[PDB]
C-alpha cells in the first residue's frame, strides 16, 4: 500500500527551524507530488505549498512562502519540510499529503506531526495506578484507570499493555493547566479478568525521553 | 515519469512504416493526444484518442490503445520525408486542464540521415 | 484567495439515515471541489474530488453534486463510522482553502453512564497532592453533568474535566472528571462522591468513598 | 497570429534580471490559457492554467523562477527570472475542460525562446 510514515513530534523554541519529514512508500515517488497541510488546534486546514519530485518545481501558499522550504530525496523517497523562523502560531499539526500533478485534490495523507512553538521548560508527566476503590466484590467487569499529571508539551503517548489490551479503553484528550497538561485513562476488562491477569498502562514522551510502565495494583 | 515513451530517435526511409510506443502508470488519465513538433516551432497536436477506445485513425497516422494495459502505440503508416520531427506522447488526468508530456521520440524519415 | 463556507456546522442523525451537508466557494470554481472526513485524532482521508467523483475506495454511501459556487455531500445509509468533521477543499488554482468543516454526530439509543471512582494514588499521596478520579463511561446522549460532593458539600474548585469523542464501536460517548487538591485538605475530609446528573435517569448517578475507609 | 499573438521571441535575459512575456488570445472561444516551459533538452512542462482575469499564480523551478498573471480576458503575461537555464517558453489556449470525455484540443503559441547561447 501506499504509506506516508512522517517525522515525530517537535518542540523547539521561538527562531528555531525544525525540519519534518515523510518517507513516501507503496507507490512510485517521482510521478506525484508532496502537498503540505497544517491543521492548527484541531480546527481548520491549511495548505503550506507543494513539491514535484521529478521537474522539482515548487509553489507556495502565498503566507508560508517566506518561511516554509520544500524538498525531495529521491533515493530515500523522502519529503521535508524545514519551518524557518517559528513563530508561536506555527505550532499545529502537519501532514504531508499526495496529490496528481494537476488536481490538487489529496490522495494520501501522513500521519500528523505536532510541532509545539515554545518557551516552556520540557516537563514529564507523572504516572499513577488508579484502582478500583476496595473491595474485589462482583459486578461481573471491572474498571482499572491510569492518569498522567503535569507535562509539557502535547504529544504523549498512553498505551495498556503495550497495545496488547487494544480494547475495552478510552484515553481522553489532555486538558491545559497552568501551563502544563493532565491527560488520563481509563480501562475495563471483566471481573475474571483481574486482578488475576496483570494489566500496566504504560506513557511516553518524546520531548523528555520518557519510558513509563506502571503496574496497576490492588489494595 | 507519469507518461513514459520509446523510442527516443527512430530514422526510417521513406516509405516504411513507424511505431512510436508509449505507457502511463496512473489508470485514471482519460484523454491520450500525440503531438507533432517541426524545428523552431511550437508543439502542433496530430492524434489523440479518449480512453474508451482501442483504436485511432486518420489516413495515415495511427494509435493503437491498451487501457487495461495501461499501453498506447503510435505508427506512421507510409513514411515521407515531411514526417521528421517530434512526436510527444501525452495524457490528461479527467477533469485537467494540463497535459503531462512523454519526453518525445525523434522520428528522421528518409535517411542515409542529415535532414 | 477563495473562501469556502460550510453548512450546518454541525448535525447528527440516526444510522440508516440520509444528510446532505453543503460548501460554498467564494467564486466561481468549477467542478474542482474535494470532501474529506476526519476522524478526531486522525487525518483527513479522501472521499470526492472534481465535485462528484468519487475517490478510489470510498463507499457509495457517499455522492457528490454540484458546481461553480454552491455543491454539496450526501452520505444515504449513515453508518456508525461515518461519525467525524467533513471538510470542503477548492482545488482550482493556488492556494487551495478548506471549508471550516461540518460535524457529524450519529444519534442512537441512550445510555446511563458507567460511573466509577477512584482515590489520590498512594504514589501521588506519597508527593503531596491528592486526585480524585472518576470517568462516567458510554453514554448517549452526549449531555452529562457531573457534581463532586467533598464530603457532602459541593465543590466547583479543582474539576478538570475531559470528553472523549463519539466512540465508532458502538456510538456511544465518555468523559472524566478530576478532582485534585492537597493531601492535607484530602486527608482532612472522609466522603468523596461523584455526581452525574444524565437524561436516563432522574435520579443522580453517584459513586463515592471513604478517605478512612481502605 | 491566429488564436494566439506571443510576444517576445527570442529575448536574451541577462542574468539577474527578469525577462517578461504575454500572450493575445484571439479567438474568444478558448478563454482557458496555459503557460508551459520546453527545457534544453526539448522536455514540455505544464507550469500553470489562469483562467480568469485578475488571477495570477506563481511556481519556481530548478534554472526559472517564474510569476504568471492573467490580466483580463485577452492578457496574460509572465515574468520568469533567476533563469540560469535557457529555455522556449510557450503560451497555450484550449475550450474550457469537459469534466467527462475530455478532449478539447490544446493550442499551443509559438513560444518564447529565453536564451542563454
Known amino acids: 500500500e501506499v504509506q506516508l510514515q512522517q517525522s515525530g513530534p517537535e518542540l523547539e523554541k521561538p527562531g528555531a527551524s525544525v525540519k519534518i519529514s515523510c518517507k513516501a512508500s507503496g507507490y512510485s515517488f517521482t510521478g506525484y507530488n508532496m502537498n503540505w497541510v497544517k491543521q492548527s488546534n484541531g480546527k481548520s486546514l491549511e495548505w503550506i505549498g507543494n513539491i514535484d519530485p521529478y521537474y522539482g518545481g515548487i509553489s507556495y501558499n502565498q503566507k508560508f512562502k517566506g518561511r516554509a522550504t520544500l524538498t525531495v530525496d529521491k533515493s530515500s523517497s523522502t519529503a521535508y519540510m524545514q519551518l524557518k523562523s517559528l513563530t508561536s502560531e506555527d505550532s499545529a499539526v502537519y501532514y504531508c499529503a499526495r496529490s496528481r500533478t494537476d488536481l490538487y485534490y489529496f490522495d494520501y495523507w501522513g500521519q500528523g506531526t505536532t510541532l509545539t512553538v515554545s518557551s516552556a521548560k520540557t516537563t514529564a508527566p507523572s504516572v499513577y495506578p488508579l484502582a478500583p476503590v476496595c473491595g474485589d466484590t462482583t459486578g461481573s467487569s471491572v474498571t482499572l484507570g491510569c492518569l498522567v499529571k503535569g507535562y509539557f508539551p502535547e504529544p504523549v503517548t498512553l498505551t495498556w499493555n503495550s497495545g496488547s489490551l487494544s480494547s475495552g479503553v478510552h484515553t481522553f484528550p489532555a486538558v491545559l493547566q497552568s501551563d502544563l497538561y493532565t491527560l488520563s485513562s481509563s480501562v475495563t476488562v471483566t471481573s475474571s479478568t483481574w486482578p488475576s491477569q496483570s494489566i500496566t498502562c504504560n506513557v511516553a514522551h518524546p520531548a523528555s525521553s520518557t519510558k513509563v510502565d506502571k503496574k496497576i495494583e490492588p489494595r | 515519469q507519469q507518461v513514459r515513451q520509446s523510442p527516443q530517435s527512430l530514422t526510417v526511409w521513406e516509405g516504411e512504416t513507424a511505431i512510436l510506443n508509449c505507457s502511463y502508470e496512473?489508470?485514471?488519465?482519460?484523454?491520450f493526444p500525440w503531438y507533432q513538433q517541426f524545428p523552431g516551432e511550437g508543439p502542433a497536436l496530430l492524434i489523440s484518442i479518449r480512453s474508451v477506445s482501442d483504436k485511432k485513425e486518420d489516413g495515415r497516422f495511427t494509435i493503437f490503445f491498451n487501457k487495461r494495459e495501461k499501453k498506447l502505440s503510435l505508427h506512421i503508416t507510409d513514411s515521407q520525408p515531411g514526417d521528421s520531427a517530434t512526436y510527444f506522447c501525452?495524457?490528461?488526468?479527467?477533469?485537467?486542464?494540463?497535459?503531462?508530456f512523454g519526453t518525445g521520440t525523434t522520428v528522421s524519415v528518409s535517411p542515409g540521415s542529415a535532414d | 484567495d477563495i473562501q469556502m463556507t460550510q453548512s450546518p456546522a454541525s448535525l447528527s442523525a440516526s444510522v440508516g439515515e440520509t444528510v446532505t451537508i453543503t460548501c460554498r466557494a467564494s467564486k466561481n470554481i468549477y467542478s474542482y471541489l474535494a470532501w474529506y472526513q476526519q476522524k478526531q485524532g486522525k487525518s483527513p482521508q479522501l472521499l470526492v474530488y472534481n465535485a462528484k467523483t468519487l475517490g478510489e475506495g470510498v463507499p457509495s454511501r457517499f455522492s457528490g453534486s454540484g458546481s461553480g459556487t454552491q455543491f454539496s455531500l450526501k452520505i444515504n445509509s449513515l453508518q456508525p463510522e461515518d461519525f467525524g468533521s467533513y471538510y470542503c477543499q477548492h482545488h482550482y488554482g493556488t492556494p487551495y482553502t478548506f471549508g471550516g468543516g461540518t460535524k457529524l454526530e450519529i444519534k442512537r439509543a441512550d445510555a446511563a453512564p458507567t460511573v466509577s471512582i477512584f482515590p489520590p494514588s498512594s504514589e501521588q499521596l506519597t508527593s503531596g497532592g491528592a486526585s480524585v478520579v472518576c470517568f462516567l463511561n458510554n453514554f448517549y446522549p452526549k449531555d452529562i453533568n457531573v457534581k463532586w460532593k467533598i464530603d457532602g458539600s459541593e465543590r466547583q474548585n479543582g474539576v478538570l474535566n475531559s470528553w472523549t469523542d463519539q466512540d465508532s464501536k458502538d456510538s456511544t460517548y465518555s468523559m472524566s472528571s478530576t478532582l485534585t487538591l492537597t493531601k492535607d485538605e484530602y486527608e482532612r475530609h472522609n466522603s468523596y462522591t461523584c455526581e452525574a446528573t444524565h437524561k436516563t435517569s432522574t435520579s443522580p448517578i453517584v459513586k463515592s468513598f471513604n478517605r478512612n475507609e481502605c | 497570429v491566429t488564436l494566439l499573438e506571443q510576444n517576445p521571441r527570442w529575448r536574451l535575459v541577462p542574468r539577474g534580471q527578469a525577462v517578461n512575456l504575454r500572450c493575445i488570445l484571439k479567438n474568444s472561444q478558448y478563454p482557458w490559457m496555459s503557460w508551459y516551459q520546453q527545457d534544453l533538452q526539448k522536455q514540455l512542462q505544464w507550469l500553470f492554467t489562469l483562467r480568469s482575469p485578475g488571477d495570477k499564480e506563481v511556481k519556481s523551478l530548478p534554472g526559472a523562477d517564474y510569476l504568471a498573471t492573467r490580466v483580463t480576458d485577452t492578457e496574460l503575461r509572465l515574468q520568469v527570472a533567476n533563469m540560469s537555464q535557457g529555455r522556449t517558453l510557450y503560451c497555450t489556449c484550449?475550450?474550457?475542460?469537459?469534466?467527462?470525455?475530455?478532449?478539447?484540443?490544446?493550442?499551443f503559441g509559438s513560444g518564447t525562446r529565453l536564451t542563454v547561447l
Open positions: 501525452a495524457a490528461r488526468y479527467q477533469g485537467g486542464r494540463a497535459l503531462i
Open positions: 496512473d489508470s485514471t488519465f482519460n484523454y
Open positions: 484550449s475550450a474550457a475542460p469537459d469534466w467527462g470525455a475530455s478532449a478539447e484540443t490544446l493550442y
